[PDB]
Design a protein around this ligand. Sequence first.
Ligand code: MG
Ligand code: MG
Lengths: 149, 148
Amino acid sequence: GMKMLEQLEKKLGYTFKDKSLLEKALTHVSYSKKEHYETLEFLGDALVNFFIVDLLVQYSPNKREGFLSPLKAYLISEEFFNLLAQKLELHKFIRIKRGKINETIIGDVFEALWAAVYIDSGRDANFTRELFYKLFKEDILSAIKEGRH
Amino acid sequence: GMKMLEQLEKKLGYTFKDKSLLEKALTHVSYSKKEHYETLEFLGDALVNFFIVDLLVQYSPNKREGFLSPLKAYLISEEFFNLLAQKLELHKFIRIKRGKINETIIGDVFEALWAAVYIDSGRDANFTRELFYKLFKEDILSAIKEGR
Ligand SMILES: [Mg+2]
Ligand SMILES: [Mg+2]
């Protein structure tokens, strides 16, 4: 009946001050050239990279870089990022032209989405960090015990 | 603390609650197989990459990723990390046995220092990022505008 252009803030557990910041992260070039998520994703690349290795360092049974690197590569692959986005029904809110979206846009939007939240929050790394954990902390650890990649 | 640490802190502009936390970041495995900077370096790598890209995203006059990546590549270079490490004469505090300090090792310790700052502060990314800007934002800015 309702919820089509949004409901994702209800998934995240975060309501944006600036809606066009959430929009932008969900907007691919083909749909909008003025403002799309390219610059947000670049930030979100490194922003999310820190959220994950900060967990890695803490919960991995090892500690040595040799056992952390192959595990790190996995937890920050588009593939895994998809499994994290699926929990967001991300594909649903992306604003993309034509019928070819793909798995590359997704994780990237997954990337631009946590950078938008970051920036929305007034550059609140901790909060945003914590918002990220409430959603996928569970899943990352799990992925840490089974040892994938 | 100790008869040395205390000065790394005044330069850094931050005093640790955990003294051995800062030491482990300065300690090469050659000096202590048990507690050495390797894991902190893991953290601080992602940590430092974050602070710097954040500044990049913010102050770059060109936003196109095709413009961003390059300067970034330098901003995380071990060359540039050494530029920043010089600001606290970090080689002076590094713990190492049989063998000499390098720029690489200095870059690895730079990373490890910031992860330890981050952890010792209560895993406070905001505070740590600001301490990082207080010290280095000015050099990163002059840098971004193709400052040799
Ligand atoms: Mg990406
Ligand atoms: Mg390193």
